[PDB]
């Protein structure tokens, strides 16, 4: 980026962080594999 303002830079396609559980498992008490959910 040769511009003085950082927002002028090219895209940032390097954020590979993920946390699906905030959407897939937003339950307060974690569910263990194989164990009855209820």
């Amino acid at each position: 980026n040769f511009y003085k303002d950082s927002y002028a830079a090219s895209a940032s396609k390097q954020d590979f962080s993920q946390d699906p559980s905030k959407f897939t498992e937003p339950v307060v008490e974690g569910l263990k594999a194989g164990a009855p959910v209820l």
Binding site: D5, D15, F16, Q18, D19, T24, P36
Partner: protein
């Protein structure tokens, strides 16, 4: 819970299961959690080292595309006796459905916007003039020009970009300029302290006005000039994904819906009909 994912997850080989008290295929949808049954627990699997990448679905790439947001045609001529050699456009991302639906897959979005302006001309034949245009960014509800030649175009502080039709499309980046930490793609409220204001329109989410004029004085003949504006968001952060739009859009000012006349995407039926729940469409007839 959070981690770095660069490829689809691998599969581990699994054996036969016959354990009392262990029922991985049973779940409870009522909890609101999505099933956590793994393939390895549902069937016997083999080991697979999966190298499939996941970068094309990164939000930056998913929304990182220059999409058409404005298209305006006007007559460039002597307007002695309508857009008189210039126009004003209140910027919005709700007029073209492809970009709109994608942005609306999210509740909040923070991004800088790369703007690209493409111009084409047609004679109303003796050749096409290489005109110079001026695109001036005028803030929200701010003072816009009323004539092709008003003093307002002197642009003392407003940013203006002058470009020729023979040059590549003009381009510049408008920073994330919301007064908040992110733009509200949806707004369940009223923009004013009184009760008669507009619903669902947060002024804070309107980038501004784009005033475009042909700088050249009119020629002896008339031309049709079309200006297309494209927007590409970058340095994107997105929050709270949402149910995709199904009903055709009706207005740029709201989420009003009516549905198609017949399925698919009719208010009464989103998916097209099949004869019955035991009728397999596209069944293989060998």
């Amino acid at each position: 819970v959070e981690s770095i994912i660069k490829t689809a997850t691998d599969t581990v080989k699994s054996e036969i299961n016959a354990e009392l008290g262990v029922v991985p295929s049973l779940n409870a949808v009522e909890t609101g959690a999505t099933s956590n049954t793994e393939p390895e627990e549902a069937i016997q699997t083999r080991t697979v080292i999966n190298q499939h990448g996941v970068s094309e679905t990164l939000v930056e790439n998913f929304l990182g595309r220059a999409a058409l947001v404005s298209k305006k045609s006007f007559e460039y001529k002597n307007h002695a006796s309508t857009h008189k050699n210039f126009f004003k456009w209140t910027i919005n991302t709700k007029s073209f459905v492809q970009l709109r639906r994608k942005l609306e897959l999210f509740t909040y979005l923070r991004f800088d916007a790369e703007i690209t302006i493409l111009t084409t001309v047609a004679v109303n034949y003796m050749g096409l003039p290489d005109l110079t245009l001026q695109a001036m960014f005028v803030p929200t509800g701010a003072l816009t020009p009323k004539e092709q030649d008003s003093f307002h175009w002197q642009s003392g502080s407003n940013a203006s970009v002058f470009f020729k039709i023979s040059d590549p499309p003009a381009r510049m980046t408008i920073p994330f300029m919301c007064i908040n930490s992110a733009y509200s793609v949806f707004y369940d409220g009223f923009a004013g302290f009184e009760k008669n204001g507009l619903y669902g329109i947060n002024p804070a989410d309107t980038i501004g006005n784009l005033c475009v004029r042909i700088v050249n004085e009119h020629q002896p003949v008339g031309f049709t000039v079309t200006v297309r504006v494209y927007m590409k968001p970058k340095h994107i952060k997105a929050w709270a994904p949402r149910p995709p739009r199904t009903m055709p859009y009706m207005s740029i000012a709201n989420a009003n819906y009516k549905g198609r006349d017949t399925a698919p995407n009719t208010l009464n039926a989103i998916i097209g009909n099949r004869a019955s729940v035991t009728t397999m469409p596209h069944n293989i007839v060998t």
